[PDB]
Design a protein around this nucleic acid. Structure first.
Lengths: 129, 190, 208, 84, 82, 150
RNA sequence: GCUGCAGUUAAAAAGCUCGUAGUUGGAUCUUGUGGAGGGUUCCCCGCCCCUUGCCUCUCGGCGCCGGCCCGAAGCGUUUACUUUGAAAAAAU
């Protein structure tokens, strides 16, 4: 089994970062995982990543720095309504000055600072800081 | 003739007509006829590259695609000289569909085949460009500005043959798909 | 390296390494000591490469040079073979030798009449001189040593592989170390042969 | 790990000695071989881990003895890749 | 750290080790800077400007440092091929 | 892991990346069809058929030389069996267990093992009947086991 | 003790397995360019095949010179979800 793909991915990157590894191996790839890691890269918590291709489900290899501290999954996937947002944002972030809870909306996957500017809630996926 | 031996798709163009004319002429000629058969194409097109060179594209009906791919090198050689200094490559004419939801109107008449979807076509397109080498690996890289560059590891069978065509494929692919590609060869193969 | 041949392997020294049996190495490996080995022999011996020895000798030595005052690069050895070697070492280049049993608490104490406070250490064989190594991480000393092929690496910033189960392998390696530091810091450099013998850096050994 | 790992590119053949599905891209390690034993001059093709007796239609008609691993040959002749 | 006032607050900015890109304490006594002396690389003689590195106590005490010092120095001198 | 044993193992086959290999193959699509039809006559079933093709001929898989598979090829004839070979092999097995139990009644170990294989029939059946590959009136019984095995 | 507890020895995992309900469940089916709003690519019209999917038309306006063009009419397989409106007694 592996009922949550996203949940198994992030624990690897958490464990790896602690030891100090700067290359990892994450499987299986999913499109959901790609856009996740895209957001995590833009802000600058991780570096460029390579998708190896198979004909099964792919595998991914990542280049990372010590900048990452902790990325989590939130299971099950709750709804957020842009007043429920603030209650969430307190609990998952160590500060008001940094960290980004991530979520998916009908306007696509993005961080919370961006979602508030689209004025649309949606389903929450994970978090990080 | 030369304007009615290629079905609909850019019927009056000078070069494209002159391609078809000498193409079918050769196929009927007895110089080779053991790898050449009189058939029609379905279109053609000429597109440049920034390398300071032109390249011709020849599309085919696609079930007839199997026969065109057979000779493909000898034939291309003759047309490299006939249209001097241009590379010539075959490709397959593949249809691509909007989503079954929420653009073009349908009654859900069909299922939207996965052999007529977008992604399946762009994979098949890559196979034609580097046809005499075949494809051993694919890898992809993602850049910090959200761009993506698609490395393609090709077999070292017929390495040299497509290694003097290696840049010209990239400018071709850009125009056909929209995507960015690079090529390489490894030293390790099954 | 990158210097023309004046910081690269010499034909002479290869003969000296092989005559002293430094290339041969013990019958065990670590997960950190497999990046200097090339491969194993027919025999249980595992063959250290000498190219890999030569580069590690240099940047190790360049760090020993980098201190402004050499009088506090404290060398240590407690096994018998590395006693005669270190004494000549610390005579040749300004250093402080600590021969025999270490007597622990040397740098940790404040009150002790044998108190020392160096900057670097150069230790023979980590698993005989474990006391000063542990104590190094209470006073922020960099550390250098001579590993066999199976000595534990932990509190060793840079290694200089060697056979070091005795013989001429010990004394030869300390001699070569002292040759390099003088070429770089001093004016002994001439790239033409040093007067001093590797002979009197070897073990005293029970005499005739 | 030494924390110097390279997973972008495989190791020369230390990647190709691991279990077959722990390789970066999966592959079988089995292969075919084109066999022509004495007295029946035809290019027979046989899988390395055949699992079964393979026949020839000439004077010879036995070529394998089933084994859990690679099948034993009845006469030690002919090995090809072939090709890919 | 900079306020909206432009006041550059915080008592000191702590050093960040090149070993694994993370920051050391102020009572971590296994964290060492190690100064390598450059040479001219034409004759083999001391020349001024040192290359200085810093390594954290955490990777040192588990014993990863031997590789880290090698990797740092391999992209420079006096190791360029090993 | 195994559905009624504790073990966790691997022995799963792994296919190559390239599927146009090994590029010398004798015979083409139409030829492969008649090669298959001959075998199904002789009492072989789709798993056996593909083995006897792969081992002694240039075929790796019929998937890689046609758009079909072994079962679909037989289905186009109407020469496909009336129920999956998978389902059959479970039912085929459980009768022999019931025979051993009638011949020896102190074998509690056998009695236990029958319950495992029994439940494994019902589970497999509950796949097929929703996919309409069996009658929805069909049910497994002692009686139906007797009739389907002989 | 949902947020937010605990079960080796402090209170505590059914002797063990099977099994219907319940709960939970792998991957897979789209990206670039001029104008407009904000940077130096990136997020209302369009373009490669698509772009609010279609037609078919006919009745009641808008046009241009009988003839022609485009808004409103059926809808995109269904839900949840999210966002906006409508709708809500007072006191507190």
């Amino acid at each position: 089994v592996r009922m949550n793909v996203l949940a198994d991915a992030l624990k690897s990157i958490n464990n790896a970062e602690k030891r100090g590894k700067r290359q990892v191996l994450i499987r299986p790839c999913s499109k959901v995982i790609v856009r996740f890691l895209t957001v995590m890269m833009k802000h600058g918590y991780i570096g460029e990543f390579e998708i190896i291709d198979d004909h099964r489900a792919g595998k991914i290899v990542v280049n990372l720095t010590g900048r990452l501290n902790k990325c989590g999954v939130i299971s099950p996937r709750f709804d957020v309504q842009l007043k429920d947002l603030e209650k969430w944002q307190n609990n998952l972030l160590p500060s008001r000055q940094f960290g980004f809870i991530v979520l998916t909306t009908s306007a696509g996957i993005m961080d919370h600072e961006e979602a508030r500017r689209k004025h649309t809630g949606g389903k929450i996926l994970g978090f990080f800081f | 003739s030369a304007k009615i031996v290629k079905p609909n798709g850019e019927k009056p163009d000078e070069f494209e007509s002159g391609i078809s004319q000498a193409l079918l002429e050769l196929e009927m000629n007895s110089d080779l006829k053991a790898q050449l058969r009189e058939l029609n194409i379905t279109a053609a097109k000429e597109i440049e590259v920034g390398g300071g060179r032109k390249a011709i594209i020849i599309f085919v009906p696609v079930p007839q695609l199997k026969s065109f791919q057979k000779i493909q090198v000898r034939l291309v050689r003759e047309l490299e000289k006939k249209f001097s200094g241009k590379h010539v490559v075959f490709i397959a004419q593949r249809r691509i569909l909007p989503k079954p939801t929420r653009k073009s109107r349908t009654k859900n008449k069909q299922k939207r085949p996965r052999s007529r979807t977008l992604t399946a076509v762009h994979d098949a397109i890559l196979e034609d460009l580097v046809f005499p080498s075949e494809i051993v690996g694919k890898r992809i890289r993602v850049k910090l500005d959200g761009s993506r560059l698609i490395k393609v590891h090709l077999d070292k069978a017929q390495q040299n043959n497509v290694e003097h065509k290696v840049e010209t494929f990239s400018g071709v692919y850009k125009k056909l798909t929209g995507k960015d590609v690079n090529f390489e060869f490894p030293e390790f193969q099954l | 390296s990158g210097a023309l041949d004046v910081l690269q392997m010499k034909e002479e020294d290869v003969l000296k390494f092989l005559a002293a049996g430094t290339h041969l190495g013990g019958t065990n490996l670590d997960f950190q000591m497999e990046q200097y080995i090339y491969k194993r022999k027919s025999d249980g011996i595992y063959i250290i490469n000498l190219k890999r020895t030569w580069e590690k000798l240099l940047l190790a030595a360049r760090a020993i040079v980098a201190i402004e005052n050499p009088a506090d690069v404290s060398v240590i050895s407690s096994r018998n073979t590395g006693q005669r070697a270190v004494l000549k070492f610390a005579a040749a280049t300004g250093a402080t030798p600590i021969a025999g049993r270490f007597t622990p608490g040397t740098f940790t104490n404040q009150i002790q009449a044998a108190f020392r406070e160096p900057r670097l250490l150069v230790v023979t064989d980590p698993r005989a001189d474990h006391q000063p190594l542990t104590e190094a991480s209470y006073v922020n000393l960099p550390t250098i040593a001579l590993c066999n092929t199976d000595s534990p690496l932990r509190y060793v910033d840079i290694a200089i592989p060697c056979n070091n189960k005795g013989a001429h392998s010990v004394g030869l390696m300390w001699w070569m170390l002292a040759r390099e530091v003088l070429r770089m810091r001093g004016t002994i450099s001439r790239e033409h042969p040093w007067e001093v013998m590797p002979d009197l850096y070897f073990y005293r050994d029970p005499e005739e | 790990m030494p924390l110097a790992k390279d997973l972008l590119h495989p190791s020369p053949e230390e990647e190709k000695r691991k279990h077959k599905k722990k390789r970066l891209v999966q592959s079988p390690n089995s292969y075919f071989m084109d066999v022509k034993c004495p007295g029946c001059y035809k290019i027979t093709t046989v899988f390395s881990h055949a699992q079964t007796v393979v026949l020839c239609v000439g004077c010879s008609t036995v070529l394998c003895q089933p084994t859990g691993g690679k099948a034993r040959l009845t006469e030690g002749c002919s090995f090809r890749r072939k090709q890919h | 750290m900079q306020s909206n006032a432009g006041e550059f607050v915080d008592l000191y900015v702590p050093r960040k080790c090149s070993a694994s890109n993370r920051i050391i304490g102020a009572k971590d006594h296994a964290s060492i800077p190690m100064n390598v002396a450059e040479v001219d690389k034409v004759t083999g003689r001391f020349n001024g400007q040192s290359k200085t590195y810093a390594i954290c106590g955490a990777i040192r005490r588990m014993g990863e440092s031997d590789d880290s010092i090698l990797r740092l120095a391999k992209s420079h001198g006096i190791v360029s091929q090993n | 892991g195994r559905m009624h044993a504790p073990g966790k193992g691997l022995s799963q086959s792994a296919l190559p990346y390239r599927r146009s290999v090994p590029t010398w193959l004798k015979l083409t699509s139409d030829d492969v069809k008649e090669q298959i039809y001959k075998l199904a006559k002789k009492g072989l079933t789709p798993s056996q058929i593909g083995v006897i093709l792969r081992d002694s001929h240039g075929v790796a898989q019929v998937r890689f030389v046609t758009g079909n598979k072994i079962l679909r090829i037989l289905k186009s004839k109407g020469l496909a069996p009336d129920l999956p070979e998978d389902l059959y092999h479970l039912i085929k097995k459980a009768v022999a267990v019931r025979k051993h139990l009638e011949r020896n009644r102190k074998d509690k170990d056998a009695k236990f093992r029958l319950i495992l294989i029994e439940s494994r029939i019902h589970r497999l059946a509950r796949y097929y009947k929703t996919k309409r590959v069996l009658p929805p009136n069909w049910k497994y019984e002692s009686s139906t086991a007797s009739a389907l095995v002989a």
